Structure 1
Amino acid sequence: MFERFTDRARRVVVLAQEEARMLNHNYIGTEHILLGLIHEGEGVAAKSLESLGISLEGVRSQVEEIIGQGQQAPSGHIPFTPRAKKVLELSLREALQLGHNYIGTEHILLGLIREGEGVAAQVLVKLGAELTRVRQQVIQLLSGY
Structure 2
Amino acid sequence: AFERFTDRARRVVVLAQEEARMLNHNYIGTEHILLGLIHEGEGVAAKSLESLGISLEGVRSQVEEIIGQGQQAPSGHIPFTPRAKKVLELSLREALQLGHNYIGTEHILLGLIREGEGVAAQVLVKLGAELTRVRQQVIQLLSG
| 1:132 Cα deviation after fit | 1.3
Counterparts of 2:141 and 2:50, CA distance in 1: 13
TM-score if structure 1 supplies the norm length?
A: 0.96
Distance 1:76 1:33 in 2: 18
- Quote how far apart the aligned CAs of 1:14 are: 0.4
Deviations 1:49-99 (A, max 9, x none): 110111001111211111111011100000000000000000111101111
What CA distance in whole angstroms lies between the structure 2 residues aligned with 1:5 and 1:34? 16
- Report Cα offsets for 1:16-66 as digits up to 9, x if no partner: 000000000110000000000000001111111110111001111211111
Report the aligned-residue RMSD: 0.7
Residue 56 (structure 1) aligns with: 56
Q: Secondary structure at the match of 1:103?
A: coil
Percent identity of the aligned residues? 100
5+ residue gaps, structure 2, are: none
Distance 2:75 2:99 in 1: 38
> Which residue does the alignment assign to 1:69?
69
Aligned length: 143
Question: In the alignment, which residue of structure 2 is the partner of 1:14?
Answer: 14
17-26 vs 128-137, which moves further: 128-137
- Alignment partners' CA distance in 2, 1:124 and 1:41: 18
1:25 equivalent in structure 2: 25
Following superposition, the deviation at residue 125 of structure 1 comes to 0.3
